[PDB]
Design a protein around this ligand. Sequence first.
Ligand SMILES: [Cl-]
Ligand SMILES: [K+]
Ligand SMILES: [K+]
Lengths: 291, 295
Amino acid sequence: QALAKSLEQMNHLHNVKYLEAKDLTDFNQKSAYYICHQIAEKQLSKEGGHVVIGLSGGKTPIDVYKNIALVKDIKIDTSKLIFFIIDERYKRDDHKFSNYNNIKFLFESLKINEKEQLYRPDTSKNIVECVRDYNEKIKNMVKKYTKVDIAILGMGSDFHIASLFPNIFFNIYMNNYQNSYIYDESSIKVANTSDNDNLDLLKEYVYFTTTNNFDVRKRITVSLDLLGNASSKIFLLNSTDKLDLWKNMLLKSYVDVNYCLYPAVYLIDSMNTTVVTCGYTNYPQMLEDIY
Amino acid sequence: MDCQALAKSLEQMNHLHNVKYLEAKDLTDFNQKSAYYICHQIAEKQLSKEGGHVVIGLSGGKTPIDVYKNIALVKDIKIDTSKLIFFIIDERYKRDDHKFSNYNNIKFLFESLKINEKEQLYRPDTSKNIVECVRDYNEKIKNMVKKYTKVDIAILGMGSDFHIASLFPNIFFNIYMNNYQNSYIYDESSIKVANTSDNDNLDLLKEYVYFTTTNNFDVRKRITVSLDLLGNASSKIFLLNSTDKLDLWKNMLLKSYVDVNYCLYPAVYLIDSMNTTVVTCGYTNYPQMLEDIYV
Ligand SMILES: [Cl-]
Ligand SMILES: [K+]
Ligand SMILES: [K+]
């Protein structure tokens, strides 16, 4: 009620909607409210009611998910929801701190039947089989339910989203296609053609990617293409540091954006990206000043 | 500039986990101390080096440039500038316009020192196409190393993505895809890639100079000397003159404590290769802030 006013105070700038929070509590409430409003709007217009929602892990999304339970004035049929894990930190031998295990309280809160309503990687398999298996599962999800309706995302200090780590083309190619380790290399002809056009060649739904060992080296991620085709992308940027990064991204991507380096901009350019913000008052004015 | 106080500075450097830290009081002291240290390193190495031919690699950017401006000011020790050998550690490549290049931004140093660039400076010919630019500079650097044995001093910074020179994480993926894939620059068959560790694959890279890429705002196409070349330098000097840069170095050391990937944290390769020094500004008793990583 206090929150439904505020979805109306929303700023639009260069095809992004910005929703501003006043502090971290407001952020988590406003974010959870906006996500429920999107799910309900989508469900109301989808024949069969089966809204497909991609979830990221991490502290910022988790503290938002904790508030989803609290949302009471929005009618949603939770038995028809379909969830999938956008990306996972792979550790075959211990799953304790995984994104799934850190966010699964949400499924319990909403009384979700995970066997029927949740797609996630089987991280008990070896990395190659885990990736190929989750690929086919996401493929089947998209066939059955047409597309992703809502993707909930964050962004790291290296501009990565999901586990799509710059340079997304090099990282995907070297981890999946080189030596046909995961997918057939004969399928793809790299030119030495923009990175953007090269990433176009990679047609799978799920890939193996890598980052540093401290952050969990081996990752499973849905593809940038899958996320760009989502009907709604929601970024959760709840600090000045994150808002500073988003601004600098927009500055540096203004000319000849390489989507392999700034994947969030691919989502922007694909339309229907919303950013919820906390840290700066009148943040969208700060951005207009660079334009 | 007070060379008397500066000399004691150098005697007072702190050591932690095989790195030397030289702490500046403020930004002006950072520039003066860094230039003083580099000069003294050059002069001492010239007394031990074959024919006095100290080999110095130079980075560009504001931070090194402001240090280079102070190299003139250092009067308290003899350097035979006619014997020095310089090279460019990395370059931002634009075939059609060179005015914002590292070379062109730092060449005032060569004029100041009255350097004969034809005889004493190795740098890329960025009027060449990228493939030939890289192969030409690779051969120049190879010739430099054959003739002068190895790099004596490498002057470096580090970026917010942990890159140094133009060695952009993931260094193996970036170098492979830009140089070896489809034999664009070097032969694909000259290297057998495994899906082992990134460190082991990095070890397979044997050239001195590579093509790398980053974002278009920062100039997409880059020429860089190899991580191996830098690791073999007798002295590596990092110039970290802000708390942002010092926060990055500390985060790096935290995250690289276990199973460091040198393709993602190249500076740690340099640390592990020994003789790395860091000059710092922004945090008082900075090594104290790092201590507990190791104890
Ligand atoms: Cl990469
Ligand atoms: K898991
Ligand atoms: K140049």
